Every structure is written in structure tokens, then in C-alpha cells.
């Protein structure tokens, strides 16, 4: 239901930061593992959000470290 709205300049800033972060990552990493597609096999069902995901903590997002 929620509409995904953002302060435009702020939004740009965020994307800019991710643009530079991403670019940095590209720079540094010798190889860059991509995701295999599709992610799951036809036998593997849509795993439950509660049973698998809701317990485990997510990795750190992309954002260049700011002074």
C-alpha cells in the first residue's frame, strides 16, 4: 500500500553515494562474484520468511563511509 516517496535532492545524494560506493567496490575487488540466475531451482520452493530469513541478520548495505 505504501507509496515509495523521497526528498528528491536527498534521493540523488543517496544514489550518488551508492554510485561512488559501487564504483569503489569495482575498483578494489580483483574478481566480482555475480549472482547465479535464477537464484533458486524449480524443486526448491519459496522459502518461508519466518523460518529462514527472519532469524538470520542481514549483511551491511552499500554506503561509502562518510566523515
Amino acid at each position: 500500500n505504501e507509496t515509495p516517496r523521497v526528498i528528491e535532492p536527498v534521493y540523488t545524494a543517496q544514489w550518488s553515494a551508492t554510485w561512488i560506493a559501487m564504483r569503489r567496490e569495482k575498483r578494489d575487488r580483483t574478481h566480482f562474484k555475480r549472482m547465479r540466475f535464477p537464484p533458486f531451482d524449480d524443486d526448491e520452493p519459496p522459502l518461508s520468511y519466518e523460518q529462514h530469513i527472519e532469524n538470520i541478520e542481514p549483511l551491511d548495505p552499500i554506503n561509502l563511509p562518510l566523515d
Partner: peptide, 26 residues
């Protein structure tokens, strides 16, 4: 040289594979 550019794995030491061995050697 297409399949070289596609190569999901390219230009690497087995830093991720050594971590798998480390996880299983444990």
C-alpha cells in the same frame, strides 16, 4: 572472447573456496 567476459568467476585466488574448506575443515 565471449565466455571469458561472461566468466562469472574470473581473475581470482580461491579466497572464497579456502573459506569453504575452512568452514568444512572445522
Amino acid at each position: 572472447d565471449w565466455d571469458s567476459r561472461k566468466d562469472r568467476w574470473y581473475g581470482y585466488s580461491g579466497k572464497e573456496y579456502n573459506e569453504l574448506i575452512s568452514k568444512w575443515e572445522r
